[PDB]
Amino acid sequence: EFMENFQKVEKIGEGTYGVVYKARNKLTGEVVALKKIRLPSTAIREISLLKELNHPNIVKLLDVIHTENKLYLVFEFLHQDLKKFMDASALTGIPLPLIKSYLFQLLQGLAFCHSHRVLHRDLKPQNLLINTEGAIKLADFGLARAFGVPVRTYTHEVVTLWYRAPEILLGCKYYSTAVDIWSLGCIFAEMVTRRALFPGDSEIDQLFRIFRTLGTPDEVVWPGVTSMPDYKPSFPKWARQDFSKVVPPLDEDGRSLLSQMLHYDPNKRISAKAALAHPFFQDVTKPVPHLRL
Numbered sequence: 264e265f266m267e268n269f270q271k272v273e274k275i276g277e278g279t280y281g282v283v284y285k286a287r288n289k290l291t292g293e294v295v296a297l298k299k300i301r302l303p304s305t306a307i308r309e310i311s312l313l314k315e316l317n318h319p320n321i322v323k324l325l326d327v328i329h330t331e332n333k334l335y336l337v338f339e340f341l342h343q344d345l346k347k348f349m350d351a352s353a354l355t356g357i358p359l360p361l362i363k364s365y366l367f368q369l370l371q372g373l374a375f376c377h378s379h380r381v382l383h384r385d386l387k388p389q390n391l392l393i394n395t396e397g398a399i400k401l402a403d404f405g406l407a408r409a410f411g412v413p414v415r416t417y418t419h420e421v422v423t424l425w426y427r428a429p430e431i432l433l434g435c436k437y438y439s440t441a442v443d444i445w446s447l448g449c450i451f452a453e454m455v456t457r458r459a460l461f462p463g464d465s466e467i468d469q470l471f472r473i474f475r476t477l478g479t480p481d482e483v484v485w486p487g488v489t490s491m492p493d494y495k496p497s498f499p500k501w502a503r504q505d506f507s508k509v510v511p512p513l514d515e516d517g518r519s520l521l522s523q524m525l526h527y528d529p530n531k532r533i534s535a536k537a538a539l540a541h542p543f544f545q546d547v548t549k550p551v552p553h554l555r556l
């Protein structure tokens with residue numbers, strides 16, 4: 264009966280966890296994103312707590328509905344995701360000032376959630392949503408704690424590894440907020456170069472692409488790494504590349520920030536809060552993007 268206290272309902276696409284619909288609420292007339300999650304009470308409690316986790320760079324969670332043994336998440340509707348926008352921007356690139364504005368807003372969103380001890384764990388361009396007024400917002404915060412992150416979606420589509428922090432790939436049991444900083448660093452590099460930084464197609468391909476760029480990690484740069492569940496002494500030993508080669512034509516400030524976002528040691532990785540104070544953002548602005556809706 265649920266899709267009846269919506270005036271109507273059409274299909275935006277296929278989420279990690281279920282189908283995503285565009286729908287209108289009949290009481291309010293508001294246009295929302297409705298996500299079906301297919302199948303647990305602990306998840307219900309934790310996801311309901313995210314209704315309070317409100318920030319202008321976090322996609323608003325309007326309602327959590329458990330009915331007929333199905334879960335529906337009701338979110339703020341935004342017209343476009345950063346994946347589509349980057350694909351639309353492929354011939355020209357996103358202008359640097361807009362890249363800087365989006366990174367700045369995304370760090371404010373991360374700083375807010377992290378301050379409340381909530382992490383994302385699965386940041387990717389597809390869950391960064393943009394509006395006509397130059398805002399960017401993080402979608403699906405705190406869901407990964409609730410439902411985990413599967414190898415495959417409900418439609419068996421492969422869940423992307425491209426943004427996964429090395430601690431996760433090496434089998435670390437405990438996530439820290441540093442996993443989100445790693446993901447956002449990967450997205451920053453992709454906005455600048457118009458190519459994914461580490462487009463792995465398996466867990467080992469993902470790790471070896473990271474190794475070939477940043478060097479094979481060792482006890483020098485990452486104390487304890489040789490004791491991680493999935494670390495092998497037999498890993499090939501690649502040398503580190505200069506960031507000047509990895510993200511041209513990013514300036515010294517941006518390369519400095521990106522380097523701190525991609526430190527192997529999660530402890531050494533820059534926080535969201537300290538990243539907001541980085542000299543890269545001294546001249547930050549809020550440009551209006553060119554959106555075709």
Ligand SMILES: Brc1ccnc2ncccc12
Nearest residue numbers: 275296322338340341402
């Ligand atoms: Br609008 C929209 C589109 C796609 N995925 C989304 N995920 C969360 C909230 C809004 C979304």
